[PDB]
Design a protein around this motif. Structure first.
Motif, mmCIF file in Angstrom:
data_model
loop_
_atom_site.group_PDB
_atom_site.id
_atom_site.type_symbol
_atom_site.label_atom_id
_atom_site.label_comp_id
_atom_site.label_asym_id
_atom_site.label_seq_id
_atom_site.Cartn_x
_atom_site.Cartn_y
_atom_site.Cartn_z
ATOM 1 N N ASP A 147 0.825 -1.181 0.003
ATOM 2 C CA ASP A 147 0.158 0.078 0.186
ATOM 3 C C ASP A 147 0.828 1.405 0.166
ATOM 4 N N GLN A 148 2.245 0.991 0.132
ATOM 5 C CA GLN A 148 3.038 2.498 0.212
ATOM 6 C C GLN A 148 4.195 2.394 -0.767
ATOM 7 N N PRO A 149 3.763 2.271 -1.884
ATOM 8 C CA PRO A 149 4.851 1.917 -3.116
ATOM 9 C C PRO A 149 6.008 3.203 -2.988
ATOM 10 N N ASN A 150 5.714 4.254 -2.540
ATOM 11 C CA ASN A 150 6.753 5.486 -2.698
ATOM 12 C C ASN A 150 6.666 6.234 -1.006
ATOM 13 N N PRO A 151 7.359 5.504 0.058
ATOM 14 C CA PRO A 151 7.315 6.149 1.214
ATOM 15 C C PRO A 151 8.240 7.444 1.144
ATOM 16 N N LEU A 152 8.221 8.208 2.108
ATOM 17 C CA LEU A 152 9.139 9.234 2.561
ATOM 18 C C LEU A 152 10.577 8.513 2.721
ATOM 19 N N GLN A 153 11.589 9.248 2.270
ATOM 20 C CA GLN A 153 12.854 8.550 2.088
ATOM 21 C C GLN A 153 13.799 9.946 2.562
ATOM 22 N N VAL A 154 14.994 9.388 3.490
ATOM 23 C CA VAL A 154 15.947 10.549 3.440
ATOM 24 C C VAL A 154 17.145 9.819 2.812
ATOM 25 N N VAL A 210 17.367 5.683 3.768
ATOM 26 C CA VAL A 210 16.475 5.149 4.646
ATOM 27 C C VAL A 210 14.996 5.494 4.524
ATOM 28 N N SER A 211 14.260 4.275 4.437
ATOM 29 C CA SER A 211 12.922 4.321 3.922
ATOM 30 C C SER A 211 12.192 4.284 5.171
ATOM 31 N N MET A 212 10.959 5.061 5.220
ATOM 32 C CA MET A 212 10.200 5.208 6.417
ATOM 33 C C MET A 212 8.879 5.114 6.257
ATOM 34 N N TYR A 213 8.390 3.863 6.582
ATOM 35 C CA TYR A 213 6.960 3.311 6.417
ATOM 36 C C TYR A 213 6.035 3.683 7.580
ATOM 37 N N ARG A 214 4.681 3.619 7.406
ATOM 38 C CA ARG A 214 3.754 3.619 8.443
ATOM 39 C C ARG A 214 3.151 2.132 8.687
ATOM 40 N N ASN A 215 3.435 1.606 9.930
ATOM 41 C CA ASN A 215 3.121 0.194 10.298
ATOM 42 C C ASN A 215 1.726 0.365 11.265
ATOM 43 N N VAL A 216 0.542 -0.122 10.585
ATOM 44 C CA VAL A 216 -0.716 0.111 11.564
ATOM 45 C C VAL A 216 -0.654 -0.744 12.886
ATOM 46 N N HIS A 248 8.222 2.831 10.710
ATOM 47 C CA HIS A 248 9.280 1.835 10.579
ATOM 48 C C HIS A 248 10.205 1.992 9.453
ATOM 49 N N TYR A 249 11.665 2.231 10.276
ATOM 50 C CA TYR A 249 12.527 2.632 9.345
ATOM 51 C C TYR A 249 13.599 1.466 8.845
ATOM 52 N N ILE A 250 14.206 1.550 7.545
ATOM 53 C CA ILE A 250 14.702 0.432 7.069
ATOM 54 C C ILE A 250 16.094 1.331 6.049
ATOM 55 N N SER A 251 17.318 0.681 6.597
ATOM 56 C CA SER A 251 18.398 1.140 5.553
ATOM 57 C C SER A 251 19.009 0.483 4.615
ATOM 58 N N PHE A 252 19.750 1.324 3.649
ATOM 59 C CA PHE A 252 20.254 0.766 2.431
ATOM 60 C C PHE A 252 21.703 1.376 2.524
ATOM 61 N N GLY A 253 22.724 0.537 2.795
ATOM 62 C CA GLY A 253 24.108 0.646 2.430
ATOM 63 C C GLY A 253 25.032 -0.205 3.176
ATOM 64 N N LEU A 254 24.559 -0.433 4.219
ATOM 65 C CA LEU A 254 25.308 -1.374 5.127
ATOM 66 C C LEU A 254 25.655 -2.759 4.308
ATOM 67 N N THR A 278 12.152 12.376 11.153
ATOM 68 C CA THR A 278 13.399 12.017 10.346
ATOM 69 C C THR A 278 14.431 11.606 11.250
ATOM 70 N N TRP A 279 14.588 12.035 12.432
ATOM 71 C CA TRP A 279 15.645 11.918 13.376
ATOM 72 C C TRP A 279 16.209 10.707 13.481
ATOM 73 N N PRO A 280 15.395 9.326 13.445
ATOM 74 C CA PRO A 280 15.918 7.796 13.312
ATOM 75 C C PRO A 280 16.940 7.637 12.320
ATOM 76 N N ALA A 281 16.612 8.368 11.316
ATOM 77 C CA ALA A 281 17.591 8.364 10.125
ATOM 78 C C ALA A 281 19.077 8.682 10.449
ATOM 79 N N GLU A 282 19.239 9.747 11.022
ATOM 80 C CA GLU A 282 20.596 10.292 11.482
ATOM 81 C C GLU A 282 20.894 9.362 12.669
#
Length: 386
Positions: A40-47, A64-70, A82-88, A128-132
């Motif tokens: 349902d969220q194909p384009n989440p907010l991202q940092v 970092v993708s930032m999703y809403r989890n009900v 719900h935050y998910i990283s890309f790069g590690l 957005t603080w969790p991304a940092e």
């Protein structure tokens, strides 16, 4: 007879991305697992890091993708970000940041970070603080090349959101939803960050991280089966429930302790090129004295060692069991010192006897075993400060 009528079921229980060639295969695989969880969220907010890490930028995490989890209040799982990283892990496979190592083994470090932050009323967008926060942790990982795994702790010593919050440290656990993925560049797992208080950090260190994680699961506000972090939480799990300390105590006894040593107020005295001592006197304050059961039951009874180091000076006491190698104290000369560093060997049977007397935890409180020529005393703080 009767002709078969058939069964009647009483209770019925509950494609590539566009321009797929644009996505590097490591990024594609993480994104695929994210898609599965959030169709349902194909384009989440991202940092996103505009200045890339391989071109001198400070931020190892590209996205970092930032999703809403009900969630499921039906199961005591609150609504959260719900935050998910890309790069590690190895996103690109072309040796720009990680060494390309093929399909076998870990992709890059072998994991990405995730995080679950309890949603506040009036939040219509993920903070957005969790991304940092995630960038800081990833910096730590890139500098040392030390890999984290499930059950590890991170002593952070700062409120995670830079507020005044009590959640000041982190444990790491398997993400409850995100499954491991196989990519052309290796296997990627998902490690979730769980915020904790100092006291909870201290407990993971004394027992083990998996044990504290499992306690956090039973306390919804801490909390919950999915281990969601609430930055407003004012109380520890031990303040919320006094009965948990007992589980920690039993856990240390059964599994052993992960604490190998502490810096504290303590001293040892002789009562008569290492020297062998016929008699010895061990001195602790109340706090260091309170760790003796952990020392004995969680270390020596598991074939391990434990070191008390003096906060001020060179003085030290290391307790050893019959299991360790390289000790200069032995069964025949169980008290031996190299300068101000004392080693003391105690057998399984004798530590069992000592434990009979050693509860807990009017000073001075002195213990004695004349047949072993050993004294242990709990003293007031003034003795060690002067």
């Amino acid at each position: 007879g009767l002709v078969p009528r058939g069964s009647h079921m009483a209770e019925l229980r509950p494609a590539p991305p566009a321009f797929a060639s644009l996505f590097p295969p490591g990024l594609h695989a993480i994104y695929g697992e994210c898609r599965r969880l959030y169709p349902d969220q194909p384009n989440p907010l991202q940092v996103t890091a505009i200045v890339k890490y391989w071109l001198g930028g400070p931020d190892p995490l590209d996205y970092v993708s930032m999703y809403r989890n009900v969630g499921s209040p039906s199961a005591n799982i609150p609504e959260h970000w719900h935050y998910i990283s890309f790069g590690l892990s190895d996103l690109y496979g072309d040796n720009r940041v990680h060494e390309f190592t093929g399909t076998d083994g870990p992709s890059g470090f072998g994991f990405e970070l995730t995080f679950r932050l309890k949603r506040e009323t009036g939040e219509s967008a993920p903070p957005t603080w969790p991304a940092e926060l995630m960038q800081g942790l990833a910096r730590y990982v890139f500098q040392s090349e030390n890999t984290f795994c499930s059950g590890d702790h991170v002593s952070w010593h700062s409120p995670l959101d830079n507020s005044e919050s009590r959640i000041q440290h982190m444990l790491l656990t398997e993400d409850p939803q995100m499954q491991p993925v196989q990519t052309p560049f290796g296997v990627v797992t998902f490690l979730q960050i769980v915020g904790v208080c100092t006291e909870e950090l201290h407990s993971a260190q004394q027992w083990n991280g998996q044990g504290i994680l499992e306690l956090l699961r039973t306390v919804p506000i801490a909390g919950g089966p999915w281990l969601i972090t609430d930055m407003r939480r004012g109380e520890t799990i031990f303040e919320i429930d006094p009965h948990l300390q007992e589980r920690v105590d039993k856990g240390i006894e059964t599994d052993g302790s992960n604490l190998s040593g502490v810096s504290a107020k303590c001293a040892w005295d002789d009562l008569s090129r290492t020297r062998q001592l016929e008699s010895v006197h061990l001195k602790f304050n109340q706090e260091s004295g309170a760790l003796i059961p952990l020392c004995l039951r969680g270390r020596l009874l598991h074939g391990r060692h434990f070191t008390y180091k003096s906060i001020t000076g060179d003085m030290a006491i290391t307790f050893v069991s019959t299991g360790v190698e390289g000790a200069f104290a032995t069964e025949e000369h169980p008290y031996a010192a190299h300068g101000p560093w004392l080693q003391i060997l105690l057998t399984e049977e004798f530590v069992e006897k000592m434990l009979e007397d050693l509860e807990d935890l009017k000073l001075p409180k002195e213990y004695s075993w004349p047949e072993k020529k050993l004294k242990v005393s709990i003293l007031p703080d003034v003795v060690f400060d002067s």
